[PDB]
């Protein structure tokens, strides 16, 4: 059970933390364009 | 000039401004307080953590009343709510010491009745007060230029 | 003159109007949003969905200011906000395509300065616009009228 | 004179008024409602039920507009919202029937622009209308006057 919860916790970090990092980069890379109404992305 | 600008209120006093461009409303993120107009307050803001800005698409009513943008930033004088501002070699310049805290979010306008930059603060170079501002690239990318030590208004 | 009438502000849009008749505030039910006046908005209106209408006693501070409803509806021209409208064959008829969405809840005025009906919307057969309206039989029975293929505004 | 005086919004109507003296807002405790000014609305009211008042400090941005006050009060004409009042025999007097409900919290002023008292409501039995008021003793200590039959406006 300890190892299974370890796997579950690792998977939680893998998913939610990588998703958070990717969202951060996506969000902050979009915003310089999303703020510009005429920028050609 | 300010005809389409909107004030931001902190506990019943002005402490900054918000402005609508490209049908979305921009306001400095550091400016605590509530936007005056309820239609703007209903907007769910997106926070650009490194821009010190938050924004959201305005209700589709004033869709026709947004400020239009232009990339055009020829060096020279530009109009402002509190005067005329001079842009040179990547520096927007204001006569030293004029303007100050609570003036964040002020737009800067082109002589063709359009916005070119928004003010977030500034600092004096000695000859002029340089302003920390957002200014969009030749390719429209919203650049932020802010000479060192620029205080947020 | 019709300043004793009040539109509904939905997202800052006059999607409809309301009138205080006989001391009761009436607005179309289909017109979403909050009424302009805050004291009128405190009234918890009672709806009558068969009429596409909702009613409620206006508070005790302005029931004197209410418009007088009018039983008599002789054939002729009746005042409105968009000038005046003809009444014919028992229906209000209006120039083709003038007036539209957002005009619901606008009262129609007796030339004597009284309200004869409140409009819901209209339709066009091709020759003339026919209005849909709430009405009152000579006996005084309040009624709703809707031409064939009526569109609410 | 009255420019630096503010209404109370109760049901969106002027049911009372509030005054700011020496940098602190005061309005009667019995008069229910919302302070009109947003900065004043932000003040943390502290109760004084025996005085029927609540009060609190105001921000420095609105320091200078506070009403100056004094205890010196010789008898004679005093300016008031309803033009003037007669202060005599230690009380403020007016033509019986003037003022009335809604004027609670209205200040009375020395032509130097110094407030001398705040109105709490009228008293009318027997001879003539006298006004219940809060006042300042020559030592500065506040005194609340309420002739028998005093009722809040």
TrEMBL record, chain A:
Compartment annotation: Host cell membrane; Host cytoplasm; Host nucleus; Virion membrane
Residue ranges crossing the lipid bilayer per the database entry: 1-23
Superkingdom per UniProt: Viruses
Subunit structure of this chain's protein: The precursor of protein E3/E2 and E1 form a heterodimer shortly after synthesis.
Protein name: Structural polyprotein
Organism of this sequence: Western equine encephalitis virus (WEEV)
Taxonomic lineage of the native organism: Viruses, Riboviria, Orthornavirae, Kitrinoviricota, Alsuviricetes
Covered residues, full protein: 687 to 727 of 1236
